[PDB]
């Protein structure tokens, strides 16, 4: 079903959108990804599909992984230390 994650990430109308959700979606569930093997694989290829979209579509895709990047690398640096 990744395929149509990705269809709606390729897709410029739905890109900025999907990708917005699905960010907000996996920044909540962020700290899971240290404590489930099969969830942290899947959050960690849905959030390379975001990064990729942000590659695909950069004029919307940016601002819309703009607000988000703090919060990844600083729940990134801080939940490894005890995951």
Do not use: W
């Amino acid at each position: 079903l990744q395929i149509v994650a990705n269809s709606f990430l390729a897709n410029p109308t739905t890109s900025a959108l999907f990708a917005t959700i699905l960010v907000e979606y996996l920044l909540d569930r962020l700290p899971e990804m240290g404590s489930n093997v099969e969830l942290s694989n899947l959050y960690l290829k849905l959030f390379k599909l975001v990064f990729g979209s942000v590659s695909l579509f950069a004029a919307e895709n940016e601002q819309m992984l703009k607000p988000h990047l703090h919060k990844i690398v600083n729940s990134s640096m801080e939940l490894a230390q005890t995951a």
